[PDB]
């Protein structure tokens, strides 16, 4: 119960909530039906509209206005945007001709620069060129200032999970706002965007930077807009707030706008009706500029121009629907649309299986527009799997379709020709991003990078201390002029034993066999060599990567490849190896078929054993450093070294053997060389961070060899490819995969086709970061290379789409 009874007289858009059923004059006040009685009257004036005209110029004041035009409105500041314009004869901000902001311009009592967030709905990357010719303001803001040629959103490409992204730093797995629907079974509680119960502060995890920003003591604006209060209305805001006192003044504003996105659902990304709303954005940015200008702060303060997600063409026809795949259908509740989420209606029913309901759902149709997965088998980039709220089962859906239960669901709920929520590699979802200010660069573009980024570069522009978030802060030091983070490598945490040879031949009792007792003091001081570590300058380009945890392991020299060997894993963690463009690929000789050596390094009881892959039925065995990659016929042994051994199933063998017999020689003829980091992921709790011996659920049979949930590549050349790889002078080119080992093909439709069909589209579609890598694994790579470490950071960040331009 709100008592409505007092008064929001100089109280309109007051920063701090007051104690209910005390009534609120707060933006939220709206939100939670608890305004004050005269709320609208005071606080949401309309007379007259939002632009002074000739005959107002220098008026009696008149405090119905909605804003104002007399002589006393700019010390009051609460002028209309255009004041100076129509009244004084000033130009509007977008006509003035753009001039470097080298220095922070401010007024006095300014401790740092204000930063302000215009955050746009549905906002696809590509209308920055689409739309350039209605919308000067932002083509003024984008080339002067810093831009992004898109930036990625998170997964899923969602308001609430991206803006809430924008918010914190984090995945949504962290933060908890992992759709725009959800089920807390924990809480038993239900969040919708409709209504009361998503405004509870149990489902909003992290910390969002307004409240780092105060618990620091800076002040904030509303970030949350609520839906009545006009676009015009909010700027007003920001601008009346920018003219506080100093000690009540804020320091970081957001602007929200709902458009394009709503056009862009009923009309489409590229309707002809969605001109209009842009040009109406475009006007609302220049109002901001306008008024900044006036309020000589044009100069001074920092503005982040952000979508939260594109839009995609989608419509009633293309839907997917399960009624046609499963007979138990009306025993799951499914999240519908752009992504699938399922779960049991009922959990007094343990006839509900997940198993079956995958089966059913997969590859049942031959140009079916969804792909189930268990949670914990999506590709590792969405970082969509570590939340109760989110269900075990998944449906990625095929961008411009939708899946839903029954066909009823779609009529009894076409309207709809736009829609986003896919995969946030997808091109049409990709957003923009723009930074203009003293602090960012003048007139520079930077490469596309995630808006999990931001969080700490708002940070660093206002001076804070960012809470724990999934950034890599550095990452993005390159958009500014000045306020970089300058971070430190992380210390290693173990370092390695350099084994010698410290074991005969038959103390080793692994059941393996090896066809190699096949028989020279040249050749015999240059294998010497090779185990001491003569070619690890060509093997190993950018130092060995530092282990970050506390743990026993190896460094194993060879002629073809250095490892890291886990004496407690049983497996190297890491395998570093560099193909030539002129390398050959050979194959593995018939006699060696089967062979696999004792590394008289290494003791047996750190070893591997062949015995333990006959007992396993399912398991077999495949090497990190391929056997056909091999220098020479007797530098081809070492690669059958039982420390060079991995557990690996058979249908994951076919992918496994593709890449390294056809793909890495491939990428090295078009990439002039590679060099190339593999190596196992343990991710059993798909947290998306190494897992500890203690939490590996699954060995092979009968012996302690853990079994890797996944197997990484990290494929590295010269961003210049007129430079072989293991000589490059300059920036580095990466990419990587983080490859879900499972025990079947079921993910790839066309498995049983040959591989050339089949495996490249797996791997692109398990595209991964070397950061991603890092975390699953307690590796940081690129120790050990020319180039600074904010571009090391960049590089680590980046992701390889696979999508055109
Ligand atoms: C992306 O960035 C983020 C942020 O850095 C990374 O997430 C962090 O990872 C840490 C490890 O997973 C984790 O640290 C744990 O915190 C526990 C206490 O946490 C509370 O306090 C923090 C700080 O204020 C808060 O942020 C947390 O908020 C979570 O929980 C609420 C719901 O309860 C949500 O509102 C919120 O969204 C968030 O949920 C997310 O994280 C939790 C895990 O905390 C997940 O379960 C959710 O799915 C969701 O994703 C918390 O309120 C602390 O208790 C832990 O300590 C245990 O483990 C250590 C190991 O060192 C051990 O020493 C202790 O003994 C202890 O073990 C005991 O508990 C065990 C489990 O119950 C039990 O088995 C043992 O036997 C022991 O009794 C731990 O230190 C940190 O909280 C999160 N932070 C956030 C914000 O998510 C993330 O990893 C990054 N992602 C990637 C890929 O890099
Ligand atoms: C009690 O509530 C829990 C608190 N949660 C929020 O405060 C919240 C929720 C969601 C989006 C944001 C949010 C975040 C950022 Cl970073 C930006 C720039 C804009 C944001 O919202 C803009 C907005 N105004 N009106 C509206 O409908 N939206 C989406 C903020
Ligand atoms: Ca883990
Ligand atoms: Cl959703
Ligand atoms: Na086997
Ligand atoms: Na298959
Ligand atoms: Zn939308």
Redesign the pocket.
């Known amino acids: 119960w709100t008592a409505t009874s007092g008064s929001c007289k100089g109280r309109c858009f007051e920063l701090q909530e007051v104690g209910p059923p005390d009534c609120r004059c707060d933006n939220l006040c709206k939100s939670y039906s608890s305004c004050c009685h005269d709320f609208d009257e005071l606080c949401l004036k309309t007379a007259r509209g939002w632009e002074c005209t000739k005959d107002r110029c220098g008026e009696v004041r008149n405090e119905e206005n909605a804003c104002h035009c007399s002589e006393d409105c700019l010390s009051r500041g609460d002028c209309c945007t255009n004041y100076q314009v129509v009244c004084k004869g000033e130009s509007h901000w977008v006509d003035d001709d753009c001039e470097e902001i080298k220095v922070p311009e401010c007024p006095a009592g300014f401790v740092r620069p204000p930063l302000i967030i215009f955050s746009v709905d549905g906002f696809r990357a590509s209308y920055m060129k689409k739309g350039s010719k209605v919308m000067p303001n932002i083509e003024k803001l984008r080339s002067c200032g810093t831009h992004a040629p898109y930036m990625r959103p998170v997964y899923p490409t969602k308001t609430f999970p991206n803006l809430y992204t924008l918010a914190t730093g ?2 949504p ?4 706002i992992v759709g725009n629907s959800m089920y807390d079974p924990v809480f038993d509680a239900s969040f919708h965007l409709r209504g009361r119960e998503k405004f509870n502060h ?1 489902w ?4 969002p930077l307004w409240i780092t920003a105060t618990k620091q003591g800076v002040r904030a604006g509303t970030f949350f807009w609520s839906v009545s209060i006009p676009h015009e209305r909010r700027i007003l805001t920001i601008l009346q707030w920018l003219s506080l006192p100093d000690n009540e003044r804020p320091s970081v504003y957001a602007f929200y706008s709902e458009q394009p996105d709503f056009s862009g659902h009923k009309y489409g990304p590229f309707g002809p009706e969605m001109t209009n709303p842009l040009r109406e954005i475009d006007k609302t940015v220049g109002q901001l500029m306008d008024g900044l200008k006036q309020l000589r702060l044009h100069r001074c303060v920092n503005v982040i121009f952000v979508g939260d997600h594109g839009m995609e063409d989608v419509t009633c026809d293309r839907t997917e629907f399960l009624s046609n795949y499963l007979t138990n259908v009306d025993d799951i509740t499914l999240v519908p649309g752009t992504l699938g989420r399922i779960r049991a209606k009922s959990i007094n029913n343990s006839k509900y299986d997940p198993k079956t309901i995958i089966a059913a759902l997969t590859c049942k149709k031959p140009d079916q527009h969804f792909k189930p997965y268990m949670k914990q088998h999506l590709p590792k980039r969405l ?1 969509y799997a ?3 709220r989110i269900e075990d089962i998944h449906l990625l859906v095929d961008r411009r379709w939708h899946v839903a239960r029954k066909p009823l669901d779609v009529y009894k709920k076409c309207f709809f020709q736009g829609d986003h929520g896919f995969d946030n590699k997808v091109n049409s979802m990709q957003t923009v991003f723009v930074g203009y200010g003293p602090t960012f660069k003048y007139r520079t573009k930077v490469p596309p990078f995630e808006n999990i980024e931001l969080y700490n570069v708002m940070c660093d522009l206002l001076g804070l201390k960012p809470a ?3 950034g890599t802060h550095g990452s993005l030091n390159h958009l500014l002029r000045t306020n970089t983070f300058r971070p430190t490598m992380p210390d290693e945490v173990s370092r390695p034993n350099y084994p010698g040879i410290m074991y005969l031949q038959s103390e080793f009792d692994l059941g393996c066999t090896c066809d190699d007792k096949v028989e020279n003091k040249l050749e015999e001081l240059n294998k010497r060599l090779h185990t001491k570590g003569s070619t690890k300058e060509r093997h190993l380009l950018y130092g060995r990567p530092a282990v970050l945890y506390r743990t026993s392991y190896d460094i194993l020299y060879h002629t073809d490849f250095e490892s890291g060997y886990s004496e407690i894993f049983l497996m190297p963690l890491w395998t570093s190896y560099t193909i030539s463009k002129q390398a050959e690929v050979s194959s593995i000789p018939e006699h060696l078929t089967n062979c696999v050596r004792p590394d008289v390094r290494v003791s047996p009881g750190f070893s591997q054993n062949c015995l333990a892959y006959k007992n396993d039925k399912q398991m077999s065995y495949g090497f990190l450093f391929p056997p056909y990659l091999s220098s020479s016929p007797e530098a081809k042994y070492d690669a059958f070294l039982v420390t060079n051994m991995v557990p690996m199933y058979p249908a994951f063998k076919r992918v496994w053997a593709y890449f390294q017999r056809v793909l890495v020689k491939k990428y090295a003829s078009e990439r002039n060389g590679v060099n190339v980091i593999s190596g196992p992921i343990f991710d059993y709790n798909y ?3 190494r897992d500890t011996e203690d939490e590996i659920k699954q060995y092979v049979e009968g012996s302690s060899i853990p079994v890797p949930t996944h197997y990484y590549s990290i494929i590295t050349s010269c961003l210049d490819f007129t430079q072989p790889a293991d000589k490059c002078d300059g920036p580095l080119s990466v990419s990587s995969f983080i490859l879900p080992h499972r025990p079947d093909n079921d993910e790839s439709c066309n498995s049983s086709e040959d591989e050339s069909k089949w495996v490249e589209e797996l791997m692109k579609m398990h595209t991964a970061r070397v950061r991603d890598i890092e ?1 699953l694994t307690g590796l940081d790579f690129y120790r050990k290379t020319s180039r600074s470490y904010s571009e090391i950071l960049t590089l680590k960040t980046y992701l390889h789409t696979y999508e055109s331009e």
Do not use: I, M, T, V
Request: avoid cysteine.
């Open positions: 984090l995945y797995e962290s933060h908890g149990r909003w995890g992290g910390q970082h570590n939340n109760r724990p978030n999934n947290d998306g961070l975390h």
